Amino acid sequence: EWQENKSWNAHFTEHKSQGVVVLWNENKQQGFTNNLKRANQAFLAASTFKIPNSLIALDLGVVKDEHQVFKWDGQTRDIATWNRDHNLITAMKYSVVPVYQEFARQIGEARMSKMLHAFDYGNEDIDGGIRISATEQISFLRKLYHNKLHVSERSQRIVKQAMLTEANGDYIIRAKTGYSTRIEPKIGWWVGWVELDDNVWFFAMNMDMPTSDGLGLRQAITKEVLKQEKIIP
Amino acid sequence: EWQENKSWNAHFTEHKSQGVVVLWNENKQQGFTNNLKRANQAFLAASTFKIPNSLIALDLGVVKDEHQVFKWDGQTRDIATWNRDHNLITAMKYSVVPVYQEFARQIGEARMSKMLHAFDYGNEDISGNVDSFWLDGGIRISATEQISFLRKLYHNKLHVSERSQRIVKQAMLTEANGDYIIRAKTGYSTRIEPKIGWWVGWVELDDNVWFFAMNMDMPTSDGLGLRQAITKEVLKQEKIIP
Numbered sequence: 147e148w149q150e151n152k153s154w155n156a157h158f159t160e161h162k163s164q165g166v167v168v169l170w171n172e173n174k175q176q177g178f179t180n181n182l183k184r185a186n187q188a189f190l191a192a193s194t195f196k197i198p199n200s201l202i203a204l205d206l207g208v209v210k211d212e213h214q215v216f217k218w219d220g221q222t223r224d225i226a227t228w229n230r231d232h233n234l235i236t237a238m239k240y241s242v243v244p245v246y247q248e249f250a251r252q253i254g255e256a257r258m259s260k261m262l263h264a265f266d267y268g269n270e271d272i273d274g275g276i277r278i279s280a281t282e283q284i285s286f287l288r289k290l291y292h293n294k295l296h297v298s299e300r301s302q303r304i305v306k307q308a309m310l311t312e313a314n315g316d317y318i319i320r321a322k323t324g325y326s327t328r329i330e331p332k333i334g335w336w337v338g339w340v341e342l343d344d345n346v347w348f349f350a351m352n353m354d355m356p357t358s359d360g361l362g363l364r365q366a367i368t369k370e371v372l373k374q375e376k377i378i379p
Numbered sequence: 380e381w382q383e384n385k386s387w388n389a390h391f392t393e394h395k396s397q398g399v400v401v402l403w404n405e406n407k408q409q410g411f412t413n414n415l416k417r418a419n420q421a422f423l424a425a426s427t428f429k430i431p432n433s434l435i436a437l438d439l440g441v442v443k444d445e446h447q448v449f450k451w452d453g454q455t456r457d458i459a460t461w462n463r464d465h466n467l468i469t470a471m472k473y474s475v476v477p478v479y480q481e482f483a484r485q486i487g488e489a490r491m492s493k494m495l496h497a498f499d500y501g502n503e504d505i506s507g508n509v510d511s512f513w514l515d516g517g518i519r520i521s522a523t524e525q526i527s528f529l530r531k532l533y534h535n536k537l538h539v540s541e542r543s544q545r546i547v548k549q550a551m552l553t554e555a556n557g558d559y560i561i562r563a564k565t566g567y568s569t570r571i572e573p574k575i576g577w578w579v580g581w582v583e584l585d586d587n588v589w590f591f592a593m594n595m596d597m598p599t600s601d602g603l604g605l606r607q608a609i610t611k612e613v614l615k616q617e618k619i620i621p
């Protein structure tokens with residue numbers, strides 16, 4: 147079922163980094179990773195939690211649709227793109243914590259907890275202190291892709307639209323980045339999938355990310371693994 | 380409201396070409412074109428008809444969802460990518476005429492006509508073969524009418540389900556990066572003169588949407604890439620895309 151291909155470690159050491167990439171070939175129901183241990187370690191979800199939070203906000207009506215505006219509160223924060231109005235699409239694009247904090251307040255602790263349980267999300271059992279492994283990310287995302295989660299079809303299609311990250315004639319990537327900072331080890335996340343004409347390859351990676359300047363490596367290393375496996379040109 | 384910008388013709392003449400680009404700025408409700416007259420001239424929809432066709436097929440249940448497979452019928456056709464199975468996503472990507480001619484037959488004349496009137500689509504005339512009227516029948520639509528139709532799709536205001544509308548917009552996905560998303564559909568009218576090339580859709584920005592529609596004289600297939608290239612040259616000139 148799962149195969150460990152340590153040759154991928156080269157793409158982490160090339161950039162003097164340590165981390166994991168987990169791939170899942172949907173057609174063949176086979177998985178691949180460079181590090182079976184780290185594939186199954188649970189790290190803090192950080193921004194990748196915006197995926198279940200979006201779904202829950204939509205299904206409960208807290209977010210009416212992807213065009214609804216969420217006004218900046220006029221408090222300047224360190225990330226300039228946050229200091230403006232947003233809709234669901236822009237808020238995911240720029241990973242706008244204060245907007246998603248608001249969704250969570252309105253959702254409330256009790257319903258948030260009931261729905262993450264319906265989703266079987268994270269390792270924890272019952273980022274709001276949610277730990278989740280890369281392989282657990284894939285399993286959650288496979289449910290999203292197939293519209294199997296316990297929310298409406300509409301909520302799931304809207305979130306998949308908001309995860310749109312890249313598209314050309316060769317592939318479509320839906321995905322979400324994350325950077326976990328408040329507890330060592332500081333790590334970057336990138337989770338999602340790449341759509342091809344007649345297959346889907348799910349992915350989930352995280353990597354030690356001590357500073358901040360390395361954050362591009364999250365996509366870059368993931369793509370080197372995809373190119374090595376001829377999943378993308 | 381409407382403004383003519385003739386400077387855009389340089390992009391056509393530099394390719395020895397004639398055509399029109401129309402742009403609609405959604406926030407400001409203003410339009411821009413190099414040729415008001417040709418913007419309002421109605422042509423055969425050709426493969427741009429796959430948008431309304433997809434919507435109707437989905438709403439009527441002819442297409443269950445974007446994963447349903449339409450097996451190739453064994454008949455080897457000229458375009459190699461047509462000679463294989465498809466779903467709605469791939470069928471739109473490769474503009475797979477025979478899949479859509481099957482849709483049209485299942486839809487039938489009456490429901491196709493009724494729907495196009497509900498859509499207020501072009502001249503709403505399906506006269507001819509039900510599975511080719513958009514290629515060599517009576518249907519006619521202008522660039523400004525494509526935009527008007529696309530804007531109704533963009534706001535989920537067509538008289539079909541929201542779901543139908545969301546699935547079709549997924550299948551129109553063409554390009555996406557950190558700067559913009561293009562949802563569009565190409566066309567090439569080839570059977571009835573004047574031969575023209577189409578490209579219609581929109582550019583999603585963070586805080587605005589620019590709808591577009593261009594057609595251009597297309598004597599030969601050698602120039603088909605110009606549809607996108609001229610449109611992007613206009614978009615770059617107007618600082619819509621880098």
Ligand SMILES: *C(=O)N1C[C@H](NOS(=O)(=O)O)CC[C@H]1C(N)=O
Nearest residue numbers: 192193194241243323324325326
């Ligand atoms: C998510 O983990 N966060 C929100 C924001 N950007 O996340 S992303 O670029 O990795 O997608 C900043 C970092 C981080 C946070 N401050 O909690």
Ligand SMILES: *C(=O)N1C[C@H](NOS(=O)(=O)O)CC[C@H]1C(N)=O
Nearest residue numbers: 425426427474565566567568569
């Ligand atoms: C649509 O106008 N057509 C279908 C097919 N797609 O070419 S496209 O790249 O312009 O969409 C070939 C051209 C044309 C046709 N001959 O039916």
Ligand SMILES: [Cl-]
Nearest residue numbers: 211212214234
């Ligand atoms: Cl929104």
Ligand SMILES: [Cl-]
Nearest residue numbers: 307310549552
């Ligand atoms: Cl999409």
Ligand SMILES: [Cl-]
Nearest residue numbers: 438540542543
């Ligand atoms: Cl429907």
